[PDB]
Design a protein around this ligand. Structure first.
Ligand code: 6NG
Ligand code: CA
Ligand code: CA
Ligand code: CA
Ligand code: CA
Ligand code: ZN
Length: 316
């Protein structure tokens, strides 16, 4: 909407206060004009029609319980925008400052979040498996990263290409979580998963097997559930990424860590210059090797560590 840029204050899903960029025109809207061609947050009102209505508020204060998922979807979309722009020189998901749109309060008891081809969508959860999913910065960045992938490599959402697609979203979700630097970890979704159980998460990148997911290619899922295991076999690539960054010895194969920033550079280059819609795990290895070679040189530690990490997870 046309109006003037304003700054509201509110509380997120986990009770923390934050400032948000809004727009004033009669009402205060969740419309952040400070980033690209805007970040827009919508109320889906417990229904499944999308996007719903652009979030309107009478006083620019967002402390009601109903407001909390909107505050966090809006704020964490801004952090994710900043990560891509400041770290990778990428302007929004399309590289051309496309408007970023999210809807919260999607459906009833909805234990998921997704990119629908055009926008982000967040359930409120059922209060048992999830609380409102925009409360996790890694979740928000995971969702926006699907849009980045779709505009770049275009990885088809099934089988190995789909597991790479998933891992890319978990990798960058985690790197955004570290960028914001509030309780960062290599776990996925811990802030919004299972409020009655402490210390768990939806997935682990450091130890995927803790939540049933494979940590070696020989343990990959080969059935048809979950689009051929896209949220399962992502563990193999997540583990490789974790090892590239942090190092370790895994199934007897030692990996020298090179740190998060270089991990992000390697994978961003692979995603945007080398991967294609049908890339498989072996082709991802090749793309990561080539990316590290471009950035750091063929004889570099970074190239050697990429090879070590894919060896450790059984991907040649
Ligand atoms: C980070 C996590 C909290 C949320 C993430 N959602 P996502 O991976 O973004 C789902 N996306 C999806 O299914 O996209 C396909 C598509 C394409 C077009 C329109 C609509 C949909 C996820 O890991 N979901 C897995 C869920 C919870 C289980 C039940 C399978 C374990
Ligand atoms: Ca208000
Ligand atoms: Ca965390
Ligand atoms: Ca996390
Ligand atoms: Ca929990
Ligand atoms: Zn995903």
């Amino acid at each position: 909407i046309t109006g003037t840029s304003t700054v509201g204050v509110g509380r997120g899903v986990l009770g923390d206060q934050k400032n948000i960029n809004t727009t004033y025109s009669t009402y205060y809207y969740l419309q952040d004009n400070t980033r690209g061609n805007g970040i827009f947050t919508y109320d889906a009102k417990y229904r499944t029609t999308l996007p719903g209505s652009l979030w309107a508020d009478a006083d620019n204060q967002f402390f009601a319980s109903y407001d909390a998922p909107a505050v966090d979807a809006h704020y964490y979309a801004g952090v994710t925008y900043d990560y891509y722009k400041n770290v990778h020189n990428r302007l929004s998901y399309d590289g051309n400052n496309a408007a970023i749109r999210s809807s919260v309060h999607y459906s009833q008891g909805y234990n998921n979040a997704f990119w629908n081809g055009s926008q982000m969508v967040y359930g409120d959860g059922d209060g048992q498996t999830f609380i409102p999913l925009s409360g996790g910065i890694d979740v928000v960045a995971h969702e926006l990263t699907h849009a980045v992938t779709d505009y770049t490599a275009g990885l088809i959402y099934q089988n190995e290409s789909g597991a790479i697609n998933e891992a890319i979203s978990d990798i960058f979700g985690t790197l955004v979580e570290f960028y914001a630097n509030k309780n960062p970890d290599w776990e996925i979704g811990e802030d919004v998963y299972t409020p009655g159980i402490s210390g768990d998460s939806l997935r682990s990148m450091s130890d995927p097997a803790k939540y049933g997911d494979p940590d070696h290619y020989s343990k990959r899922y080969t059935g048809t559930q979950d689009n051929g295991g896209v949220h399962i076999n992502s563990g193999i690539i997540n583990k490789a990424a974790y090892l590239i960054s942090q190092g370790g010895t895994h199934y007897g194969v030692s990996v020298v860590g090179i740190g998060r920033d270089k991990l992000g550079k390697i994978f961003y280059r692979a995603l945007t210059q080398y991967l294609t819609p049908t890339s498989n795990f072996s082709q991802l290895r090749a793309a990561a090797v080539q990316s590290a070679t471009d950035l750091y040189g063929s004889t570099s530690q970074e190239v050697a560590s990429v090879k070590q990490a894919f060896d450790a997870v059984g991907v040649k």
